[PDB]
Amino acid sequence: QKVGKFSPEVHPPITWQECADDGSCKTMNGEIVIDANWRWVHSEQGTNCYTGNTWNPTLCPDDKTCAENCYLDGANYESVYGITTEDDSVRLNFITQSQGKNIGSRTFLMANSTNYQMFYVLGQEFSFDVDVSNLDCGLNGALYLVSMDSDGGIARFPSNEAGAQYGTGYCDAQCPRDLKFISGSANVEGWIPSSNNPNTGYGNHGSCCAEMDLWEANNMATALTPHPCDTSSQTVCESDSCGGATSSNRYGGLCDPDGCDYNPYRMGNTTFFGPGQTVDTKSVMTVVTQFITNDGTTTGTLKSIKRLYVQNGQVISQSESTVPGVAGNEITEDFCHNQKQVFGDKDSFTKHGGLAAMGDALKNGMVLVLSLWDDYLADMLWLDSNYPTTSPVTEPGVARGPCSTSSGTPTDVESKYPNAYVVYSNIKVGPINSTFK
Numbered sequence: 462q463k464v465g466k467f468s469p470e471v472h473p474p475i476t477w478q479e480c481a482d483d484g485s486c487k488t489m490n491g492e493i494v495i496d497a498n499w500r501w502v503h504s505e506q507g508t509n510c511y512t513g514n515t516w517n518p519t520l521c522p523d524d525k526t527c528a529e530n531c532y533l534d535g536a537n538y539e540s541v542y543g544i545t546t547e548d549d550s551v552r553l554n555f556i557t558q559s560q561g562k563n564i565g566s567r568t569f570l571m572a573n574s575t576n577y578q579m580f581y582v583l584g585q586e587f588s589f590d591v592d593v594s595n596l597d598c599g600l601n602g603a604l605y606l607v608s609m610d611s612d613g614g615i616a617r618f619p620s621n622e623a624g625a626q627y628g629t630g631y632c633d634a635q636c637p638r639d640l641k642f643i644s645g646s647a648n649v650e651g652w653i654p655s656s657n658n659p660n661t662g663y664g665n666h667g668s669c670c671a672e673m674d675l676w677e678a679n680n681m682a683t684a685l686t687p688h689p690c691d692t693s694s695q696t697v698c699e700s701d702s703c704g705g706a707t708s709s710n711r712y713g714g715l716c717d718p719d720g721c722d723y724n725p726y727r728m729g730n731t732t733f734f735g736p737g738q739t740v741d742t743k744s745v746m747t748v749v750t751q752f753i754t755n756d757g758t759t760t761g762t763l764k765s766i767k768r769l770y771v772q773n774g775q776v777i778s779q780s781e782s783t784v785p786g787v788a789g790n791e792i793t794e795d796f797c798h799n800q801k802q803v804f805g806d807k808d809s810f811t812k813h814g815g816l817a818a819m820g821d822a823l824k825n826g827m828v829l830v831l832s833l834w835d836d837y838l839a840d841m842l843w844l845d846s847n848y849p850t851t852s853p854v855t856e857p858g859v860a861r862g863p864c865s866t867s868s869g870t871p872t873d874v875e876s877k878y879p880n881a882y883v884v885y886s887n888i889k890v891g892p893i894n895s896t897f898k
């Protein structure tokens with residue numbers, strides 16, 4: 462992608478902290494960039510290169526031609542995308558009106574104006590605070606890690622002239638082909654609009670990546686899900702090599718589209734995560750995610766992922782799995798194997814390396830994503846509600862939340878909750894047990 466000049470790109474700044482065993486935590490300055498896919502893509506004096514879910518056929522006949530012709534540009538974070546920052550806090554609004562109608566956003570935490578803040582959390586812990594009280598079923602405020610390049614693909618693909626500044630170089634375990642710019646080129650070739658989503662379509666190329674879903678939730682449900690890949694860093698895909706939820710064969714690819722999820726509701730305890738419940742979604746909460754290794758050091762193999770919450774001065778641990786025979790409250794090899802077994806989902810997790818593989822991604826740098834969206838693929842029924850909708854409720858793994866099968870249809874949630882939003886704050890990174898108590 463090339464760089465336009467109609468608006469300057471100003472990242473709204475955010476603080477976060479780095480802790481030590483003490484409990485002492487030092488303040489680190491950072492800033493937030495919107496994903497390139499939400500940007501206006503225009504010609505020298507555009508004239509859109511991309512409107513709705515369809516490219517400009519004259520401006521973008523090919524990837525090479527479109528790369529010559531089209532430019533990324535600066536984003537008005539508040540007035541257009543509903544994005545603001547407040548000391549340690551970031552807020553993302555769902556529906557924001559201006560010249561156009563914006564639905565949600567995907568953003569990344571940057572260290573400086575040109576580079577993503579890489580995190581190294583193997584044997585470490587990652588903590589943050591979140592307000593999901595103004596979210597409802599159908600919505601998903603996601604906070605997660607991906608194996609992106611610090612620079613946004615500039616070093617590997619010089620034709621990319623914008624880089625991490627303009628939020629380029631995205632990838633994940635879904636190996637997504639909806640990205641307009643992949644690897645220094647456009648992805649207009651072989652574009653097919655989405656069947657239900659009027660904003661997205663899919664080109665002949667995708668962007669594979671490891672993915673550690675720390676947090677995907679609304680006020681009714683949450684999910685912690687590692688997604689390993691055969692190879693860890695950003696790999697490009699051709700069309701049907703991809704796999705992923707978007708494609709027609711989701712498992713014919715190099716990454717795991719499902720992951721080893723832990724959802725308390727899905728694992729049996731239906732009075733743990735929700736409004737007025739053990740972990741009370743009506744109020745702000747701290748979300749701790751430890752990453753235990755073999756030797757308890759930063760160099761060992763990822764043995765376990767532990768979840769602790771902190772609310773109102775009380776440490777509250779992850780609730781157990783009452784599913785037989787799926788034991789514990791931690792994500793491990795043995796838990797994941799029995800999970801996939803007992804639930805009857807394809808064990809794509811192990812096929813692509815499992816937790817060992819996911820540790821390897823974490824061993825290298827991974828970038829922090831903060832996002833908020835509704836789901837056009839599955840109406841978010843895999844997070845809240847019963848999935849698949851046809852199967853019996855009481856069948857193990859079917860019920861993931863207390864929400865209707867009929868809810869979460871994008872048109873309804875966009876019509877119902879235009880003032881909905883998420884709040885991410887109080888981001889701390891340090892040794893196990895160093896970011897709370």
Ligand SMILES: *[C@@H]1O[C@H](CO)[C@@H](O)[C@H](O)[C@H]1NC(C)=O
Pocket residue numbers: 572573574575576
């Ligand atoms: C951003 O941080 C990276 C990593 O240290 C560095 O390579 C780059 O030069 C930085 N940019 C600055 C300080 O302007």
Ligand SMILES: *[C@@H]1O[C@H](CO)[C@@H](O)[C@H](O)[C@H]1NC(C)=O
Pocket residue numbers: 730731732733739778779780781783
């Ligand atoms: C649900 O989880 C909570 C939190 O650990 C626990 O106190 C409660 O016993 C669980 N419910 C059942 C039926 O075990």
